[PDB]
Amino acid sequence: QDLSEALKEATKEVHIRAENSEFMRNFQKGQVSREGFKLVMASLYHIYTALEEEIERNKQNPVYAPLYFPEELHRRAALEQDMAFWYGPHWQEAIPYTPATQHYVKRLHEVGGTHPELLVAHAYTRYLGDLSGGQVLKKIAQKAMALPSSGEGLAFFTFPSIDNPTKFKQLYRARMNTLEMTPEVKHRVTEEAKTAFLLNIELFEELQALLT
């Protein structure tokens, strides 16, 4: 059984739960506020910053290397543009860094520093979702907040080096399936992907509480 299928199957239940967190439910319905959106985007900025520092650390490591697609997928530069848009030119000092974001970042560094064979779980959880449902969420954010089609403020959701998100997803999946894989590693990759999802759910629970 292929890793990319194992992961999708192992995370389908927790995905249903992540979509039905209060924050994403509100989001889905078009009820995102500028404050809420700013909080989540500032949190992703720290998260992707951590994920991508660790992808760099391990880019030559064969437990990750076949998924090294910085030009196409990396999000940090995009989030930096979005932060300047939403928080202004001194965004670096304005943006929050919540404890639930700190927790996710911490685990990202643990995985990247000490269990890099699990980094694929974290890249899967974030990038493949960004290439799928992320595009749906973009449209909702755009309509809710009157964001222009020109893309300012939504650089995170825009992949200028991928023509077709779905084709790239297929490539990414086919490359996932070339990773060297023992039952040990596979079993723990799918577990870690479930933790990645939980860390996101916990971020969302946290943000909702901060907002209400």
Residue numbers belonging to the annotated binding site for heme b: 8, 15, 124, 173
Instruction: Give 28-40 as a 3 state SS string.
Output: HCCCCCHHHHHHH
133 contributes a contact to ligand HEM by CB under 6 A: yes
Distances, alpha carbon 131 to alpha carbons 102, 108, 136, 138, 173, in Å: 25, 20, 10, 11, 12
CB of 18 to ligand HEM, least distance (A): 4
Tell me which of 65, 136, 171, 210 binds ligand HEM, using CB under 6 A: 136
Burial 22-31 (b: 16+ CB within 10 A, else e): ebbebbeeee
* Residue 147, number of CB atoms within 10 A of its CB: 18
24 contributes a contact to ligand HEM by CB under 6 A: yes
171 contributes a contact to ligand HEM by CB under 6 A: no
| Segment interacting with ligand HEM (CB under 6 A) among 14-22, 39-47, 70-78, 88-96 | 14-22
101 contributes a contact to ligand HEM by CB under 6 A: no
18 contributes a contact to ligand HEM by CB under 6 A: yes
- Ramachandran angles phi, psi of 162, nearest 5°: -120, 125
Tell me which of 66, 116, 129, 165 binds ligand HEM, using CB under 6 A: 129
Task: Pick out the residues of the known binding site.
Answer: 8, 15, 124, 173
37: nearest Cα among 122, 126, 142: 142
Rounded CA-CA distance 171/95 in Å is 35
Instruction: For residue 211, give every residue at least 6 positions away whose Cβ sits within 8 Å of its Cβ, in sequence order, or none.
Output: 23, 33, 35, 36, 39
Tell me which of 157, 159, 172, 197 binds ligand HEM, using CB under 6 A: 197
| Segment interacting with ligand HEM (CB under 6 A) among 78-86, 107-115, 130-138, 156-164 | 130-138
Amino acid identity, residue 12? K
Binding site for ligand HEM (CB under 6 A): 7-8, 15, 18-19, 24, 27-28, 124-125, 128-129, 132-133, 136, 197, 200
